[PDB]
């Protein structure tokens, strides 16, 4: 029962899987680049300098990897590289311990679906004493085992002796990440994505000169594919992260620059690159065609094939006379309907019994697939997958491109139109350009009911109508959520804040994504104003989708009684006119003391007063209240972050927070002093004695009297 | 081990009742669905759907004022991490 | 059994409007139930 699981679908090619994608991440100056150059010199025996952009090397006969040294300061780079990445070489300084950036990245990976994490520890030569080193090793390893699973192994590196880490530890790390053995994930096995290897603009320089460096240029993008076969027809929408939402104008697959040497020798075997073994390009050194031809009318199609409305439902028969004349006899469909002579009779009885039973208990799949419902489910999965495989293997030209599209590991180029001058100008190769093909639900725009909680290590809670730069799907954008609760499952009353240790519902405008989808949001993506605080502010999932919500904010109306009798009171200062009191008359009203009532009739001579019957004699000092509900609306804000469009690529600044705009405009925290809390001291009251009527006191009998 | 099918009693009104605590999971070595308790409606927020819980026995000694009979299993871990750790905010549920 | 202390927090009671401090000591439910019990006792003895 440890080995049981939840079944899932693995959409990876058995034929030519793409390079696995590893993200070397961590703090600013923790030798995150040296690790890449020394791991590459291990894998391919050539020292490299000026590593920038993705860089693909080839491991073993069947593997190839893609190194991504992430820029250590940009949270958007952390977010989308945690969306795409597969093996995370997360590196922790030894002397300094864990840092906030490592911490934040582990949290966004945990929320967007955990890739294979692998810690390495650096600066282990700066430790003065072997016992301090050993204790710190154990402390790091156990905190790491708290965050990542327990038993997770992390490596230890000494000092950079020649711009390179020790060969034995690098060899161990290489063997591990070359037998890493990854696992399926839902988002990665639902969508197509790519990490663009090479980037090229496409216009004429004459067009640029005529337009004056403002025309949005065509862009060619080269890279491998992953995840899900990208459909080969042009004009599908695909979101480039941090640039915007474009559509592919033209697709074409290419010869891949790094073919794995198994595949290379297999091509050479079929036919009858050993020096260039890395790839850092950003760095330097028939009825079917009858049907689908559009110019042919379907009459001509059927005419050539042999040699009409659809709003009607019945098919086009012929004359009943011809039909009866043809169907006097049934021996044309008698085949569809259902010693030597004895043997033939037993065989036809076996066939009759076979058609009688059919598929009832035919191996039951249970004893066939070894008495575990999980194995049965995964066997169904694998059977469907191999049927997919043989049907794909049937034909070359269309069954590879037109039907399924470019699978994965097909080194493809794609050109887009209307791509900004800011992108082409401020493009620098130190940043990842990842691309995710969307869906219908992800191209729509509505409001999402999410449920979210404040992050546990975040200090301050999140206010309603406070902008949140959140990441949900391939998109990062700031919105104006509204944090709601159901008052014991009757109505979605909005709160004013986040409950500090549990989940509240939220609702917010923004591009839709599927149900059950986890997401996480920060408040400040701008690196220039971070401080020592934890950046990640909210975690949650999105549950459902609509275009509107009936969302209530409670408002209560107060009045004050000014003349009271037994069980009746005249109430003032709650309405303005007799028309208003008539509009609200017949009301379940109550007072601070907790006695119930109703407003009964509009009083005539004052303008707003009325008479209200309570259940008991209300005091004069008390304040009546009338609970009622008022509908609020969701603000329709949506501002997607465009940091790759920005030139500085950090310090993207959008809508400031409420505290920030108050401090900048130099206002004050609004607070009516009548609403604060006090420490009261309720005195003991001595009620007056009873006063009998004098007629009663006279007419009382002699003994039972007041003496 | 089991897969969470549906969170029952979500549409109940009075909070923290046993029909709100209940879930419905299907055990994976049988394909057989059965209910399970989850303490603390917060932990009910933690368990949503397609989750791979690890049930255990209940092992009560006395009943309660609103308990459901026959719900003999409880939920120990969800998606690999412990419900008590998730509730006390030691850990974080990895999707 | 299984309850956070922040769940077990506290909820303070707010006071009378300062603009309406002529009429004093906004009465809550404990004071109301004391007043109602005393009035019920008086009504009982008067009926007797």
């Amino acid at each position: 029962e440890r080995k049981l699981h939840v079944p899932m679908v693995d959409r990876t090619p058995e034929d030519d899987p793409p390079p696995f994608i590893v993200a070397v991440v961590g703090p600013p100056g923790t030798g995150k680049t040296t690790l890449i150059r020394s791991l590459v010199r291990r894998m391919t025996k050539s020292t490299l300098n000026d590593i920038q952009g993705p860089i693909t090397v080839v491991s073993g006969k069947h593997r190839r990897l893609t190194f991504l040294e992430c820029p250590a300061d940009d949270l958007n780079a952390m977010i989308d590289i945690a969306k795409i990445a597969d093996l995370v070489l997360l590196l922790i300084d030894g002397n300094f311990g864990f840092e906030m950036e490592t911490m934040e990245f582990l949290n966004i990976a945990q929320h967007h679906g955990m890739p294979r994490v692998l810690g390495v520890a650096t600066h282990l030569d700066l430790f003065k004493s072997q016992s301090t080193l050993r204790a710190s090793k154990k402390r790091l390893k156990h905190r790491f085992w708290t965050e990542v699973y327990q038993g997770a192994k992390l490596f230890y590196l000494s000092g950079v002796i020649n711009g390179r880490y020790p060969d034995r530890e690098i060899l161990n790390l290489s063997r591990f990440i070359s037998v890493m053995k990854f696992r399926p994930l839902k988002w990665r096995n639902e969508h197509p994505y790519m990490l663009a290897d090479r980037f090229t603009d496409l216009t004429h320089p004459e067009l640029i000169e005529t337009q004056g460096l403002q025309i949005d240029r065509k862009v060619a993008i080269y890279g491998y594919l992953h995840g899900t076969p990208l459909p080969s027809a042009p004009g599908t929408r695909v979101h480039i992260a941090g640039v915007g939402d474009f559509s592919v104008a033209q697709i074409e697959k290419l010869p891949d620059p790094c073919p794995t040497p198994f595949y290379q020798q297999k091509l050479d075997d079929f036919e009858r690159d050993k020096d260039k073994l890395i790839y850092a390009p950003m760095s330097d050194v028939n009825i079917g065609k009858l049907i689908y031809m559009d110019n042919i009318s379907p009459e001509e199609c059927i005419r050539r094939w042999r040699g009409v409305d659809l709003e009607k439902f019945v098919p086009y028969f012929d004359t009943f006379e011809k039909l009866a004349k043809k169907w006097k006899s049934v021996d044309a469909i008698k085949e569809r309907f259902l010693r030597e002579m004895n043997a033939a009779k037993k065989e036809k009885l076996r066939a009759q019994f076979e058609i009688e039973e059919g598929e009832n208990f035919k191996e039951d799949d249970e004893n066939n697939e070894y008495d575990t419902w999980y194995e049965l489910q995964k066997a169904k999965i694998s059977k469907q997958l191999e049927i997919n495989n043989i049907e794909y293997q049937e034909m070359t030209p269309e069954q590879r491109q037109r039907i399924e599209g470019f699978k994965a590991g097909s080194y493809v180029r794609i050109v887009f139109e209307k791509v900004p001058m800011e992108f082409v100008k401020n493009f620098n190769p130190k940043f990842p350009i990842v691309m995710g093909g969307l869906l219908p639900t992800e191209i729509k725009f509505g409001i999402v009911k999410a449920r979210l909680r404040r992050h546990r290590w975040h200090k301050k809670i999140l206010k309603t109508n406070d902008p949140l730069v959140l990441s949900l799907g391939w998109r990062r954008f700031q919105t104006l959520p509204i944090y709601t609760t159901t008052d014991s499952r009757t109505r979605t009353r909005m709160l004013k804040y986040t409950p500090e240790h549990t989940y509240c519902n939220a609702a917010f405008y923004g591009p839709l994504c599927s149900p059950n989808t986890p997401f996480c949001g920060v408040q400040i993506v701008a690196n220039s104003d971070t401080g020592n605080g934890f950046r990640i502010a909210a975690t949650g999932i999105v549950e459902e989708i609509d275009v509107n919500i009936e969302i209530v904010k409670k408002l209560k109306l107060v009045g004050f009684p000014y003349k009271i009798f037994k069980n009746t009171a005249f109430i003032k200062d709650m309405f303005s006119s007799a028309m208003e009191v008539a509009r609200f008359e017949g009301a379940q009203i109550k007072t601070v003391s907790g006695i119930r009532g109703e407003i009964k009739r509009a009083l005539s001579k004052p303008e707003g007063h009325y008479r209200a019957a309570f259940e008991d004699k209300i005091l004069m000092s008390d304040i009546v209240i009338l609970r009622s509900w008022y509908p609020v609306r969701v603000k329709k804000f949506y501002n997607p972050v465009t940091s790759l469009l920005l030139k500085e690529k950090t310090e993207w600044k959008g809508l400031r927070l409420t505290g920030q705009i108050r401090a900048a405009m130099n206002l004050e925290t609004p607070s009516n002093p009548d609403s604060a809390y006090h420490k009261i001291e309720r005195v003991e009251r001595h009620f007056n004695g009873l006063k009998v009527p004098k007629a009663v006191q006279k007419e009382l009998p002699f003994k039972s009297q007041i003496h | 081990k089991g897969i969470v099918l549906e969170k029952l009693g979500i549409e109940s009104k009075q909070p923290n009742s046993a029909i709100r605590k209940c879930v419905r999971v299907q055990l994976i070595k049988n394909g057989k669905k059965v209910t399970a308790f989850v303490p603390n409606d917060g932990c009910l927020n933690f368990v949503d759907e397609n989750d791979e819980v690890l049930l255990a026995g209940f092992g009560r000694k006395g009943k309660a004022k609103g308990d459901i009979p026959g719900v003999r299993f409880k939920v120990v871990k969800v998606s690999g991490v412990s419900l008590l750790a998730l509730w006390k905010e030691k850990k974080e549920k990895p999707r | 059994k299984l309850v956070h202390d922040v769940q077990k927090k506290q909820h303070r009671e707010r006071s009378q409007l300062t603009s309406r401090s002529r009429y004093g000591f906004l009465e809550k439910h404990k004071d109301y139930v004391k007043r109602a019990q005393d009035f019920h006792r008086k009504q009982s003895t008067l009926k007797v």
Binding site: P27, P28, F96, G97, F98, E99, M100, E101, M103, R143, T146, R456, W457, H501, T530, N532, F534 | A85, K88, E89, K90 | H4, D5, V6
Partner: peptide, 21 residues
């Protein structure tokens, strides 16, 4: 400095324990 060391809260990781003595 320029390095952001982690909080005592997230270093020690005691989530929500009651008050003791």
């Amino acid at each position: 400095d320029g390095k952001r060391a982690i909080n005592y809260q997230i270093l020690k990781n005691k989530g929500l324990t009651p008050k003791r003595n």
